Write a protein that binds this ligand. Structure first.
Ligand SMILES: CS(=O)(=O)c1ccc(N2CCNCC2)cc1NC(=O)c1cccc2ncccc12
Lengths: 39, 156
């Protein structure tokens, strides 16, 4: 059995850590809700 | 139960100790998470119970106690923040410019950020603080790095 615990407020934080890139990817979505890389 | 708005952990005792299987969003009295986190099972909140109300395995989403409430969308231009809630670590905002998933059905924003599996369901925010989607359904790229869709449902 599963339960929930509160972790925070949903707010934008000025001077959050900024990272990650922005790839443009072709993907397929199957009936199971799984993305796969088309190439 | 704790009906208060904000981000929450999703825990089970069914594995070793207390394991975080993912995250969700409480808004207007409705809990929002990804389908693969709960597989549509009921949740406990103190004494309070949470029963599934809506879900779809293909969108990989589920809502509890009422219909899906989150309707904000990425403008396709601005940076956003993943409000990441990793297992056993504090909620931590990360800012990024989304990439793109191009599909036969149109285009979705994607966030290229690596986190443990139990982070599935962490909310993605716009500059006004509105939830534009949940993190943790996506793909693994050439690098071996993860790219998540910005997964969002519909409001009636
Ligand atoms: C392992 S899990 O319990 O989180 C999970 C279960 C099931 C599924 N899918 C969703 C679509 N229909 C059912 C199948 C996806 C996930 N997430 C991930 O695998 C993952 C989540 C975060 C980050 C990652 N980084 C790399 C690889 C993977 C991930």
């Amino acid at each position: 059995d599963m339960y929930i615990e509160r972790a925070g407020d949903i707010t934008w934080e000025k001077d959050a850590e900024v990272t990650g890139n922005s790839p443009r990817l072709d993907v397929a979505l199957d009936e199971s809700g799984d993305f796969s890389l088309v190439e | 139960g704790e009906t208060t708005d904000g981000v929450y952990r999703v825990m089970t005792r069914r594995l070793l100790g207390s394991t975080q299987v993912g995250v969700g969003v409480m808004q207007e009295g409705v809990f929002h998470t990804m389908w693969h986190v709960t597989k549509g099972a009921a949740l406990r909140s103190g004494e309070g119970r949470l029963d599934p109300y809506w879900g779809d395995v293909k969108q990989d989403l589920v809502s509890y106690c009422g219909p899906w409430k989150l309707d904000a969308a990425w403008d396709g231009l601005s940076e956003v923040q993943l409000l990441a809630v990793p297992p056993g670590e504090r909620a931590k905002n990360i800012q990024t410019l989304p990439g793109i998933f191009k599909t036969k059905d149109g285009d979705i924003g994607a966030v290229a950020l690596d986190y443990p599996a139990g982070t599935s369901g962490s909310p993605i925010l716009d500059k006004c603080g509105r939830v534009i989607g949940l993190y943790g359904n996506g793909v693994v790229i050439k690098n071996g790095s993860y790219v998540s869709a910005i997964t969002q449902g519909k409001r009636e």
